[PDB]
Design a protein around this nucleic acid. Structure first.
Ligand code: SAH
Ligand code: CA
Ligand code: CL
Ligand code: CL
Ligand code: CL
Length: 259
DNA sequence: TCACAGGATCCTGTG
DNA sequence: TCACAGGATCCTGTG
């Protein structure tokens, strides 16, 4: 199921399997919502949270615009698969005006669609030799058809209030894989998230957590130990096949850990 | 005789 | 991107 935008680490292809394991709830809390692959596709009320304010503000803005507003901008900046100089201009405009619609248009044209915003709040992703495509308006339409049930927020995961009846879904930056958002992460942040999860458990609140125990030769030892206190679902089909067929090393063990 | 240039080391951020 | 210039500190040497 579609996410609002292309996004490193999105859960589009895994969502059906994940919904399999979800519990019932009064409110769905997507604590690290990212590209919104989870939030757009679960029953509301939904609280979509992400520490990257510019992206959250961009979603809040999308609610009131039409695909036509997007094309007008793309037209006025004469962007294309090869408009490197035009892309730099849009980038500067987004950086001094901070209008979220521009951030939305920029993301379609940058390096691997990455949205990188530095400390000063500027977008520094280089040109990606690309522009809108078949899925652009699709993800866009899917966002419009399902954003009603969402309340957006941009707080650090531990500063979000968790209410009884909340089903907390947690898909954070993973230490052992590669993403720009990994700059907001560390062994300490992870200890904090796992303690938070344990508390939710102490309070009888259901949670679900996405991660990887092994990737390319690296393993997350503390996460493996911690996962033994809960249910564990292995999701990478290839990883599971190879496990039964006993024949390979350095695979990606994608898991879903839950109480 | 304390101001300051430049070094060293670590780490951050960009193309 | 994943190299790698150059911040950020703290420190050492210089007149
Ligand atoms: N401390 C923190 N609190 C909340 N969100 C955080 C965070 N640190 C990083 N993030 C956010 O963690 C997200 C991990 S990626 C999650 C992707 C999402 N499930 C999808 O389908 O697109 C990123 O979007 C990042 O901005
Ligand atoms: Ca370079
Ligand atoms: Cl003097
Ligand atoms: Cl490059
Ligand atoms: Cl002197």
């Amino acid at each position: 199921m579609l996410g609002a935008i292309a996004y490193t680490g999105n859960k589009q292809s895994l969502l059906p399997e994940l919904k399999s394991h979800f519990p019932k709830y009064n409110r769905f809390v997507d604590l690290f919502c990212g590209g919104l692959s989870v939030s757009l596709n679960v029953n509301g009320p939904v609280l979509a949270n992400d520490i990257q304010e510019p992206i959250i503000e961009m979603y809040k803005r999308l609610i009131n615009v039409s695909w036509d507003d997007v094309l007008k901008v793309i037209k006025q900046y004469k962007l294309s698969k090869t408009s490197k100089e035009e892309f730099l201009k849009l980038r500067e405009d987004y950086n001094k005006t901070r209008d979220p619609l521009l951030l939305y248009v920029l993301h379609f044209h940058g390096f691997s669609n990455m949205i990188r915003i530095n400390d000063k709040g500027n977008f520094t992703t280089p040109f990606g030799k690309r522009t809108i495509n078949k899925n652009s308006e699709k993800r866009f339409n899917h966002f419009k058809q399902n954003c009603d049930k969402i309340i957006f927020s941009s707080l650090h995961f531990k500063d979000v209030k968790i209410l009884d009846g909340d089903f907390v879904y947690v898909d954070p930056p993973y230490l052992i894989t590669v993403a720009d958002y990994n700059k907001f992460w560390s062994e300490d942040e992870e200890k904090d998230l796992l303690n938070l999860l344990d508390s939710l458990n102490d309070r009888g609140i259901k949670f679900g957590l996405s991660n990887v125990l092994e990737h390319h030769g690296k393993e997350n030892t503390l996460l493996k130990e911690w996962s033994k206190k809960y249910n564990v679902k292995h999701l990478n089909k290839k990883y599971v096949f190879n496990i039964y067929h006993s024949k390979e090393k350095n695979g990606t063990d994608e898991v879903y850990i839950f109480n």
